[PDB]
Amino acid sequence: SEEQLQHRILTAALEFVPAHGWTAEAIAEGAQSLGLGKDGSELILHFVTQCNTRLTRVLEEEQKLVQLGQAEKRKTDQFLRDAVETRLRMLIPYIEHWPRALSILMLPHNIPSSLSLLTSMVDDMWHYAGDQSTDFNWYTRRAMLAAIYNTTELVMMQDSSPDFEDTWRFLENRVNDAMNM
């Protein structure tokens, strides 16, 4: 199908986003290295979808590493702090243009797509922490982690500390205050 063409076009555009942004100019410039809307919603939703897929592989590889050896299981609060930091570090190369991307994700017609992607991400984080909730605690735990991720992402946008050390300190206190329910 032609879906592979646009997937490759969108994949190639990400190499020029830090220079141009999340507009259709980088979509064309990224495609110019391959041979072949202007809002940018498709490019942003593609990047978020691929970053969620990369996170699943990273968490899965750490799970089999702890089930065998050369890795010791850690506490839930420690695990969730590492999963959020791992996912947020994928935004470092695009840190300058991400506030613009967040604005597009917050548009009213993009809200259902952004929420489903965010729900799938925190569901994966809680699964690899060993959640196994079959009651309303399923919604409580995932809503709590979604709020932690979104507020930590906003702190990361306006953070100038070395290696975002003030962002991870904010994440630590957030997670600690949430485990004391």
Partner: protein, 173 residues
């Protein structure tokens, strides 16, 4: 097709959870009467059904219905509201619940066969076994084919209609 099996598991988990709450309400009122042992055996039967669907929810990573806190209260109230009428009101509620659960099992067996019996073989065996257990109740004297009063047949239908609405809402929400 995960979306199709998740909807089936979520609504079956919600149905057995609501049936647990109904027998909890009936046991709270009629637990020391002569029908206490019958209600206890019914309650124990659905504890095993709910235990099995909890395992399937963990295995297949199914999202539970968001209406479980609502089924927690409505199930207990319906079970307690009946059995305050008496033993005939309690048994009318029981039959209306068992038939409503077995009715939805048949629909799922039908749609599961039409897609892929080889792939959905383990799940089909479980649903068929549970569907059979929702209808036997002969060692306890509970026969689903009994001439109820004309007013108790309406009450059974109203309860059965309400369970169908709850089933409809739970597989989506």
């Amino acid at each position: 097709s995960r979306a199709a099996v998740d909807r089936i598991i979520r609504v079956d988990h919600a149905g057995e959870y609501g049936a647990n709450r109904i027998y909890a309400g009936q046991m709270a009122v009629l637990g020391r009467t002569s029908v206490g042992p019958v209600i206890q055996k019914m309650w124990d039967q659905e504890k095993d059904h709910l235990k099995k669907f909890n395992e399937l929810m963990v295995t297949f990573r199914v999202r539970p219905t968001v209406l479980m806190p609502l089924w927690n209260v409505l199930g207990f109230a319906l079970g307690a509201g009946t059995a305050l009428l008496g033993k005939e009101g309690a048994m009318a509620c029981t039959v209306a619940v068992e038939e409503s659960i077995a009715h939805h099992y048949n629909n799922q067996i039908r749609t599961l066969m039409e897609e892929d019996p080889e792939k959905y073989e383990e799940l089909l065996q479980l649903i068929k076994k549970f569907r059979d257990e929702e209808l036997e109740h002969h060692d306890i004297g509970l026969d689903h084919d009994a001439e109820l009063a004309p007013a108790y047949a309406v009450l059974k239908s109203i309860i059965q209609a309400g369970c169908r609405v709850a089933i409809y809402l739970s597989e989506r929400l």
